[PDB]
């Protein structure tokens, strides 16, 4: 399990959170290409959808 560690310490009692957004601002977004996926599949031709229709 320790092979998956991503932070140096854990949350220890009276620790303060800091909000990194403090003003309204439009977001610029960066990613690795495979980080966001769109799972896609056409709706069944026998579902509640399209079980009556051409």
């Amino acid at each position: 399990q320790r092979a998956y560690a991503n932070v140096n310490t854990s949350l220890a009692d009276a620790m303060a959170v800091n909000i990194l957004n403090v003003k309204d601002a439009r977001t610029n977004v960066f990613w690795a290409d495979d980080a966001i996926r769109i799972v896609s599949q056409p709706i069944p031709a026998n579902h509640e959808l399209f079980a009556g229709m051409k």
Partner: protein, 152 residues
């Protein structure tokens, strides 16, 4: 229904047994009534095997409300006869009595009728095995139809 509490069930059972009723001149003591209610609770807990037995809607009394007697049993209209007949059969040995053949037969019939609907509901067919295919009939429709059945 005139029977709406555990004590009403107990009194009906005693009337069935012939020990005590409304027209009687000698009655049974409240300690014995509490003992009969305790036996009713034991029988109900034995029937409703923590949800895996006979479902009736019976509500088990808690210790916070002092008298277990006085609480609505919560049974449906069709369960009262079976419940108090079986209770009379169970509490007959208390008063050096043995329940009669009619009472025993009615208790058997009532318990069977109690479990009939639950048996119908629980009679379910298992899903397809994990190694069965879905068939080529379920392939041209729903173009992304699965090739094999999930299971579990």
């Amino acid at each position: 229904m005139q029977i709406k509490t555990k004590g009403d069930l107990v009194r009906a059972a005693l009337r069935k047994l012939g020990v005590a009723s409304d027209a009687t001149l000698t009655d049974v003591e409240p300690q014995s009534m509490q003992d009969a209610v305790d036996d009713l609770e034991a029988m109900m807990a034995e029937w409703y095997q923590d949800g895996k037995g006979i479902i009736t809607g019976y509500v088990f009394s808690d210790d916070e409300n002092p008298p277990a007697e006085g609480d609505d049993h919560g049974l449906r209209s069709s369960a009262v006869s079976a419940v108090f007949h079986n209770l009379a059969c169970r509490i007959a040995p208390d008063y050096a009595l043995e329940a009669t053949a009619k009472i025993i037969a009615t208790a058997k019939y009532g318990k069977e009728l109690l479990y009939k609907q639950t048996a119908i509901s629980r009679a379910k067919r298992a899903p397809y095995p994990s190694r069965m295919p879905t068939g080529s009939g379920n392939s041209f429709a729903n173009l992304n139809e699965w090739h094999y059945f999930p299971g579990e």
